[PDB]
C-alpha cells in the first residue's frame, strides 16, 4: 500500500537522525587524546590503545542506529 | 484560577492607577521621610 | 511617626504620570472592545 | 466596583499599616517589625545609590520604593490561595511597566535633547554597519517596554494556575482506588513545596523590577 | 596564610619515626631578633 | 633528570618518572614532560629513576620542569622512611593544642602535616 | 491494517533517537580517562575498571531505547 | 481500532527519546570521577557513597521515562 | 476514537521532558565530586546543598511526568 | 469537533517540551555555586544571593512553559 | 473552522519550545557571574550590571517565544 | 482552510529559531565576565567586542522574528 | 493549491530553526576573542582580524538556511 | 500532484537543519585558532594551515546538506 | 502520488544526521590547534591523531548522505 511504502521512505530518514550523537562522541575522544598527549609527550604508547577503544565504543552506538535504518530498508 | 480574563479593564485600571499615584505621593511626603527622621535623630545624638 | 513633609512629588515626576494618561485613554477603547465579549 | 477595585484598596491599607502601625507608637529604637523596614530602607537606598547612583538617585528613591513595596506586598497577598490577583491581570502589570518605561525615555529625551539618539550608537564601528547598530539598538531599547512587565506577570500567574490545576489532580488522586491512598503523602508535599516557593518568587520579582528600572534610569540619565 | 610562611612551618612541622638529624633541628629551631629603624632611630627591637 | 635540593642537604640534586603532589592535583613527569611551574604542596612523593623508586615525605616546595627534562624540585626538607608513628602521636597532641590555641593558620598546617605524616 | 503497519515502522524510527545520548556519553567517560592518565601517568589500574563501569551504564540507557525500537518495529 | 493500536505504539516511540538524558547524566558523573581521582586519588572512600548516589539518581529519571514507554506500547 | 488515541499520544510527548532532569541531577553530583576532590573538605557545607540541587533538578522532571498523567487520563 | 479537541491535548503535549531548558539551567547554577565555593572557600556571602537569583530566573522559564501546557489542555 | 481553531492551538504549543534556549542562556550568564566573582573576589560592582544585562537579553528571547505562545493560545 | 491553519502553525515553529539566540547572548557575556574578572582592566577594550558579538548573535534571531511577522501579518 | 501554500507557511517556520545555530556560532567566535585578549592582553591587534574572519564564515552557514527559506517561498 | 509539490518543498526544508552543524563547527575551529595564537603569541604559522584545513572540512558537511536541499527543492 | 512525495520527504529527514559530523570534525581540529600550541612540538604525532578523529566524525555524516541519496535519486 502507498501508505506503508511511503512510511518506509519517511521512516528510513527518521531513523538516520540518531547517528549524529556517535559522530560528536568520536571527536571528543580524539580531542582528549590530542590534549593528553600534548600534556605529557611520551604518554602516547600507553594511552593510544585506550583512545582507540573509546572511539570504537562511541562509534558502536552509531552502528546500532544505522542497523535500524538498514533493517527498515532491507528487512 | 480558571478564569482571569476580565472585560472590565478600564474600570480595573482606573482604580489600579489611582493606587500607584497614591502610593507615590504617600511614600514621598509621609512614610519614606518619617524613616529618615529616625535616622537623622539617631545620628544627631551621635554627632551631638 | 507620620508627618507631612513638602518633598518633591511633581516637578521631576511628570512623564510617569503622562504615560499613565495615554494608556488610560487607549485602555478605555480596549475595554470597550473587550466588553462586547 | 469590581473585585480588582477591592484588592487595590486592600494593598493601600496594608502599606499604611506597615508605616503607621508596624511600630508601637514612635520610637528611636523600633519594635521587632520595624527592624525589617530599616533593613529594607537601607537595601533600596544603597541599591539605587548603587545603580543610578547620581545626586538624582534619591530623586528616584521614592519611585523605586513605591515600585518595590507595591509588588512586594501584592505577591504575598495574591499568594493566599483565595485571593484575587492584581498581578495576574497582565493588562494592569504590563500597563504599569510601559508607563514607567515611557516615563524614562521621555525624561531622557527632555533632558538630553536629540543627542538622546547618540545612545543608540554607544561606540564606533565600521561605517556600513553604523546605521545597522542604530536600528537594532533602538529595537532592543523598546523591547524593554514589555520585557519588564511580562516576566513578573507570567511568574505570579503561573504559581496560581499551577495550584488550582494541582488541586484538581489531588482530588482525583483520592478518586483513584484506596490502594493509592496508602502512602498518599507525596502530592500534598508537592503543593507544600510550591507554597514555600510562591512567596519567594513574589519577593524576588519585586526586587528584580526595582533593580531593572533602576538600570533603565541609569541608562537614561547616564547615556551610552 | 602567606605561602612562604606556610611552607616554612610545613618544614618545621614535618621535622616534628622520629629519626631526624641535628642539621634538620638547626634548620627549624633558631632564636633571633629584628629591629624596626626610623626612616635612623630604633622603634622597638622586637624578637623574631 | 631531577634535582631535589634542600638547604643544607640535597636528595637528587636522567630521572625517568617523578610523581609529585602539586597545586594541579597530582602530576607525573615522564621523560620529557611539558615545562611547568607548580608550587609543591606538603606531600608524599615517589621518585623513580629507572624502575628504582625512592619515596620521600616532603615539606612542600616548588616544582619546575625545565624544558631540558631537568626537574628542579626545591624543598626545605624531604626519605619517607625517616619520618615513617610516635611522631604522628606527638603531632596529634600538638594539633589538638594548637586547635584550641595566625593561631588558626598554625592549627591548619598542623592538621595538614599530621594527616600527611599519617599517609607515611 | 495499513495504518498500524505504517505506525510500527515510524515508531521504530522515533525510538532510535534515544540512542544518541549514550553515544556521546561513552565518549565523555573516555575523554576523561585519556586526560586523567595524562595527568598522573599511573592512575590507570584503579581507574580503568571505573571507566568500563561508566561506559556500560551509559550504554545501557541507550540500549533501553533500542529495545523499544525493536518492540515497535516487529511488534 | 487500528488507530488505537497505532496510538499505543506511537506513544511508546515518542516516550523513548527521554531515556537519552539520563544516559548523558551517568557519563558526566564518571568523567568527573575520573578527573577527581587523577587530581586527588585519596578522595575515593568519601566520594564512593556520593558517586553511586549521583549515578543512581541520574539513571532513575530515565527508568521512570522507560516505564511510560512500555505502558503505552503493550497497553 | 481519535480522542482515545489522543490521550495516549499526549502522554508520550510529555514523557520526553524527563531527559533534562536526568542530565541536571548528574551535573549537581558531578560538581560535588569535583569540589570535594579539590578541597578534601568543601563537603560539610556543600553536601546539604548538593541534595538540594538534585531535588530541584528532579522536581522539573516531576512536572513533566505530572503533565503525562494529565494527558494520559485526561 | 474531534479535531479541535485533539489539538488541545496535542498542543499541550508539544508545549511541555520547553521545561527541559530550565531543569538543566538550575543544575548549571548550582554547579557554578559549588565550583566558585570550592575555589574560594569564602566568596559565599556575596555569591549566595547571586546564585539564588540565577536559580529563580532559570526556573521561571520552565514555570511559564508549564502554565501554557495547562492552558492548552484544560483551557 | 475546526481545523483553523485546532491549528491555532497547535501553533501555541510549538511556540513554547522557544523558551528553552533562553532558559539555558540565563543559567550560562549566572554561571559566568559566579565564575568571574570567584576569579576576582571583588569584580561585582561593574560586573553585576553586566551580568544582569546578559540575563535580561537572554531571557527576553525566551519571553518572545512565550508571547507568541499566548497570542496563538488565547487567539 | 489549510492555508490559514498553516499560517498559525508556521508562526509557532518560528519561535524555535529564536531559542538559539537566547543561548548565544549568554555565551558572549560569559566570555566577557571571565575576561574582565581575570584582568580587571581588559574591560575598556573588550566591552566594544562584547557588544558587537551580542548584536550579531541577536541579528540572526531578528531574521527569525521578521519571518514570524511575515507569516502572522501576512 | 491549499496543500502547497499551507506547506510554504509551515516550511517558513521550519527554516527559522537553522538560524538559531548560526546565532550560537557567531557568539562562540566573539567569546573566544574575549578569552584570548583577556589572557594575553596584547594579542588583540592580530587576533581581531581572525575573529572577524571566523564570525563571517559561521554567519554564512546561517545565511544558507535563510536563503532556502526564500527559495521555498 | 499537490501533495508532491508540497513534499519537495518540505524535504528541502528539513535538509536545512543539517546546515547548522557546519556553522557551529566553523566557529569552533576559529575559536581554537584564537585561543592557540593568544596562548603562544607565535604558534600561528604552524597552526594556521591546520586551521584552514579544519574549517574547510567542517563547512563541507553543511554544503552536502545544502546540495541535497536543492536536489529536493528543484528536483 | 504519496509514495513519490515520501521519497522526497524521507530523503530530507535523513539529512538532519549530518549536523553531528560537522561539529565533530571541528572539535578534533580545535584540539589539534590546542595540542600544537600547548607543547609547541607535539605536532607530528598529534597531526595523524587529529586527522583520524576528523575522518571518523565526517563518516557519520557521509552515511546519512548516502542514505539521503538512495531515497532521493532512488
Author numbering:
A (entry chain 0), G (entry chain 1), H (entry chain 2), J (entry chain 4), K (entry chain 5), N (entry chain 8): 1 to 75
B (entry chain Z): 1 to 48
C (entry chain Y): 1 to 37
D (entry chain T): 26 to 249
E (entry chain I): 8 to 23, 27 to 49, 53 to 61
F (entry chain H): 11 to 23, 26 to 90, 92 to 97, 99 to 115, 118 to 136
I (entry chain 3), L (entry chain 6), O (entry chain 9): 2 to 75
M (entry chain 7): 1 to 73
What text appears in the publication on this structure?
To test the hypothesis that the peripheral stalk of ATP synthase deforms under strain, we next added ATP to the preparation and froze cryoEM specimens. Classification of the resulting dataset yielded maps showing six different F1 states, corresponding to the catalytic and binding dwell structures from each of the three main rotational states. Subclassification of these populations separated each catalytic and each binding state into conformations with increasing rotation of the rotor relative to subunit a, and increasingly strained peripheral stalks, designated as ‘a’, ‘b’, ‘c’, etc. Overall, 27 unique conformations were identified: State 1binding(a to d), State 1catalytic(a to h), State 2binding(a to b), State 2catalytic(a to e), State 3binding(a to c), and State 3catalytic(a to e). In contrast, the structures that show the more strained peripheral stalks appear to be calculated from images of active enzyme particles. Density for the binding dwell conformations suggests that they contain MgADP with Pi in the αβtight site, as was seen in the bacterial F1 region during ATP hydrolysis. To facilitate comparison of the ATP synthase conformations that occur during ATP hydrolysis, backbone models of the protein structure were fit flexibly into each of the 27 maps. Remarkably, the α3β3γδεc10 models from all 18 catalytic dwell conformations could be overlaid with high-fidelity (left), as could the nine α3β3γδεc10 models from binding dwell conformations (right), with some limited flexibility at the interface between F1 and the c-ring. This observation shows that, other than being in a catalytic or binding dwell conformation, the differences between the structures are mostly due to deformation of the peripheral stalk subunits and the rotation of the c-ring relative to subunit a in FO.
ATP synthases use a transmembrane electrochemical proton motive force (pmf) to generate adenosine triphosphate (ATP) from adenosine diphosphate (ADP) and inorganic phosphate (Pi). ATP synthases are macromolecular machines consisting of an ATP-hydrolysis-driven F1 motor and a proton-translocation-driven FO motor. The F1 and FO motors oppose each other’s action on a shared rotor subcomplex and are held stationary relative to each other by a peripheral stalk. In Saccharomyces cerevisiae, the FO region contains subunits a, e, f, g, i/j, k, 8, part of subunit b, and the c10-ring of the rotor, while the F1 region includes a trimer of catalytic subunit αβ pairs and subunits γ, δ, and ε from the rotor.
